[PDB]
């Protein structure tokens, strides 16, 4: 815990186009006035290589709400799963310019991923 | 166990409300504490004033907003404590006088609705309206039912304000 | 999060009038479950079959 | 509903508002019954009270009246009408106390001996009651010497007649 | 039959204008009333039959 | 003040709620494994669709018998009010009736009948004294050792002399034999004063 | 408008207007020598 | 099969329960009305009726 969240974390539960009215959806949300974990990790920049920094593995319940002040690459994307070592499928998002690979490859990791 | 009730003194005027545990001791609720005879009000604070009730509690208790602006709670008063001047040889006799008109709002009728047994119930249905006839007959009573309801609201609008039979200019 | 929102909810608006409404019913849990049970002095003879 | 039980929650909400409905009417019942209160008893603005002296020309108001001799301040008639008459339900207590009632009934009382009927149509206007009964004879035919000649027995009769509701009330 | 949106109805021109993400919408009942076809960009009410 | 209307609202309003309710409802699966009647019976089969749609069909139809239960339980309210409202209008309106608080608070003189959506406003014109005064009175007076009555007035004493006044307005009179009637002898009222009459 | 079919009442506001207008009329330049 | 069941028994007891409640209420309040009204003539005022 080292930050708060006023209002942020509210997305469109469904794609029903509603006009000037008040609807009640029992999903899952962020709840307003809530812990947000701001994990800062900058510990290797601008040079190459360094295949072992500082970061443990975050769990995923049900639902995760990720912002990010990133300015031009820093954030280029995230991994899923369950195992991460060649037991399971997983969930790749890595961003790139002008596309995004999207892949649900089962294949082994390492306990820093890093796009270098 | 019990019913928790949020007395809220408008949203327009300010943000700050006070909830009340139905039938709670006020020593199961996990910020003045006062235990009344309907519940634990957690929120408001007993002031010796008595005012006119506000907003209704319940045993008398009332709360409304009056001041640093915050929910005080206070008995209702019945109203001012007038002593007539009784005597056998004294009375009372008006030397003026002041019309006042008064209003007083009565319903006469309401709205005239009709339904349908087999389009509410079958929706664009056609076996389902087999099987509708064939579980009783819950379906001609109501229509009758809601007939009567509308010649009964005719009838009212027609004896309360026809009562005459020639039209004054 | 506030009793003010769940009365908000509870009308379904978001301005909410002067008065007392009600939006839900409180209740204390229980817990310790006690699984209470009599002696045990009749037990099986085992130790003269064995 | 549901006692105790966590699944039983899950499928009442799939029958639809079935369950505020019925909340909604209880609340309206009760906001009546508070409004029955509230219209019979509170009619009038000023609460009176009685004066010290309890001579009104020769009448006994002492049944009726409130007796201040007693932690309860009501009338003997009262206390006698008084003394005779939870798995998820709740029993809400009346917005209108019994004391407030009390005092709504003796002010009203008050208001009807001390000046008669003009309370209830403006300003109280003092009034005898040896005078007020003059103007209540008028009203059915008989006229007001018949009272200034025969007003011992009708007090008398008056007041014989208040002992027996006491009596016929409890027996 | 508007992938899945099985009903009937009169589709008339609307003249609201729907995100780029949504489909179809409810009125203050839960009702379907007003839907956009995927196949050109445009808006259409749907009132109900006679 | 918009809460004059309130009453206007309360009939309004409660009908709207229960329409909504009603509609609302049809949303709610009573045993089934949807609401739409297409999908169950799509799929499904006929013989296992009649488990379903004869409890929708229960739900629907209790449903519906609760609306018109509870209109039949608002009608009887609004009969009620309809017919204490006829029976203002022709006792207030088409005439003067003396009973106290049913033609508005006080004297009934006028009332005037203003039309309302599903209701009606009664203009009560009521009479409220003001200004009152505090005098001395009397029962009787003894002139010629014979009792003398109000036959429509009332004795009172400004602190020197007697007069004659109405039962609701201040209106000094001189004590003459044309309002008085004599009834007995001065020896049974208790009360009376000496005074002169003038014949 | 899923089966349900409000029905308009018999007298219009119209009609409700003119019988408190005749009222009044009758209220003011007769008092209660109409009603009876 | 049997939850589903009985808790459309208890819905359908506790609206029977409201029902009756309502019918009561009804009657109360024409009471009430009736003891406002003689409360107001006989109490407020001599009543010829």
């Given at each position: ?116 | ?40 009000l957690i929120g408001a604070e007993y002031v ?122 | ?28 849990q229980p817990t310790e479950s006690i699984v ?15 | ?171 | 039959?508007?992938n899945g949106l099985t009903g009937t109805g ?41 | ?199």
């Open positions: 815990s080292y930050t708060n969240s006023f209002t942020r974390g509210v997305y469109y539960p469904d794609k029903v186009f509603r006009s000037s009215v008040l609807h009640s959806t029992q999903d899952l949300f962020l709840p307003f006035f809530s812990n947000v974990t701001w994990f800062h990790a900058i510990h290797v920049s601008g040079t190459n290589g360094t295949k072992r920094f500082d970061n443990p593995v975050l769990p995923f319940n049900d639902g995760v709400y990720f912002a990010s002040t990133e300015k031009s690459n820093i954030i280029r994307g995230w991994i899923f799963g369950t195992t991460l070592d060649s037991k399971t499928q997983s969930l790749l998002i890595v961003n790139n310019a002008t596309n995004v690979v999207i892949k649900v490859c089962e294949f082994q990791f390492c306990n820093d991923p890093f796009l270098d | 166990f019990g019913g928790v009730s949020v007395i809220t003194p408008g949203t327009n005027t300010s943000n700050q409300v006070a909830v009340l545990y139905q039938g709670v001791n006020c020593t199961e609720v996990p910020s003045n504490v006062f235990q009344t005879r309907a519940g634990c010796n004033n008595s005012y006119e009730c506000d907003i209704p509690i319940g045993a008398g208790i009332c709360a409304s907003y009056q001041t640093s602006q915050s929910i005080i709670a206070y008995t209702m008063s019945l109203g001012a404590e007038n002593s007539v001047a009784y005597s056998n040889n004294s009375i009372a006799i008006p030397t003026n006088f002041t019309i006042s008109v008064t209003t007083e709002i009565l319903p006469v009728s309401m709205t005239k609705t009709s339904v349908d047994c087999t389009m509410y119930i079958c929706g664009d249905s056609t076996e389902c309206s087999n099987l509708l006839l064939q579980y009783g007959s819950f379906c001609t009573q109501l229509k009758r039912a809601l007939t009567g309801i509308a010649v009964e609201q005719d009838k009212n609008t027609q004896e309360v304000f026809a009562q005459v039979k020639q039209i004054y200019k | 999060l506030d009793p003010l929102s769940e009365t908000k909810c509870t009308l379904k608006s978001f301005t909410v009038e002067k008065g007392i409404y009600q939006t839900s019913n409180f209740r204390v209470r049970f009599p002696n045990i002095t009749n037990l099986c003879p085992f130790h003269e079959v064995f | 509903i549901c006692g105790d039980s966590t699944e039983c929650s899950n499928l009442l909400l799939q029958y639809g508002s079935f369950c505020t409905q019925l909340k909604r009417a209880l609340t309206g019942i009760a906001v009546e019954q508070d409004k029955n209160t509230q219209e019979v008893f509170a009619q009038v603005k000023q609460i009176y009270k009685t004066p010290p002296i309890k001579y009104f020309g020769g009448f006994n108001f002492s049944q009726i009246l409130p007796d201040p001799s007693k932690p309860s301040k009501r009338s003997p008639i009262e206390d006698l009408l008084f003394n005779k008459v939870f798995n998820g339900l709740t029993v809400l207590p009346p917005l209108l106390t019994d004391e407030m009632i009390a005092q709504y009934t003796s002010a009203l009382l008050a208001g009807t001996i001390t000046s008669g009927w003009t309370f209830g149509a403006g300003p109280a206007l003092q009034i005898p009651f040896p005078m007020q009964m003059a103007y209540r004879f008028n009203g059915i035919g008989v006229t007001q010497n018949v009272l200034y000649e025969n007003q011992k027995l009708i007090a008398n009769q008056f007041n014989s007649a208040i002992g027996k509701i006491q009596d016929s009330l409890s027996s | 039959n508007f009169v589709l008339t021109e609307s003249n609201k204008k729907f995100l780029p993400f949504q489909q179809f919408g409810r009125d203050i009942a839960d009702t379907t009333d007003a839907v956009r076809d995927p196949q050109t960009l445009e808006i259409l009410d749907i009132t109900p039959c006679s | 003040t918009p809460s004059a209307l309130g009453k206007l609202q309360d009939v309004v309003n409660h009908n709207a709620q229960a329409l909504n309710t009603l509609v609302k409802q049809l949303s709610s699966k009573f045993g089934a494994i949807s609401s739409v009647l297409n999908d169950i019976l799509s799929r499904l089969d006929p013989p296992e669709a009649e488990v379903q749609i004869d409890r929708l069909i229960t739900g629907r139809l209790q449903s519906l018998q609760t609306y018109v239960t509870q209109q039949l339980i608002r009608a009887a309210e609004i009969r009620a009010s309809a017919n204490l409202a006829a029976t203002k209008m022709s006792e207030c309106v088409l005439g003067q009736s003396k009973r106290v608080d049913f033609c508005g608070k006080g004297y009934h003189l006028m009332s005037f009948p203003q039309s309302a959506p599903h209701g009606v406003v009664f203009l009560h014109v009521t009479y409220v004294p003001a200004q009152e005064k505090n005098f001395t009175t009397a029962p009787a007076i003894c002139h010629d050792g014979k009792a003398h009555f109000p036959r429509e007035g009332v004795f009172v004493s400004n602190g020197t002399h007697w007069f004659v006044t109405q039962r609701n307005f201040y209106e000094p009179q001189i004590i003459t034999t044309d309002n008085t009637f004599v009834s007995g002898n001065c020896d049974v009222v208790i009360g009376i004063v000496n005074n002169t009459v003038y014949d």
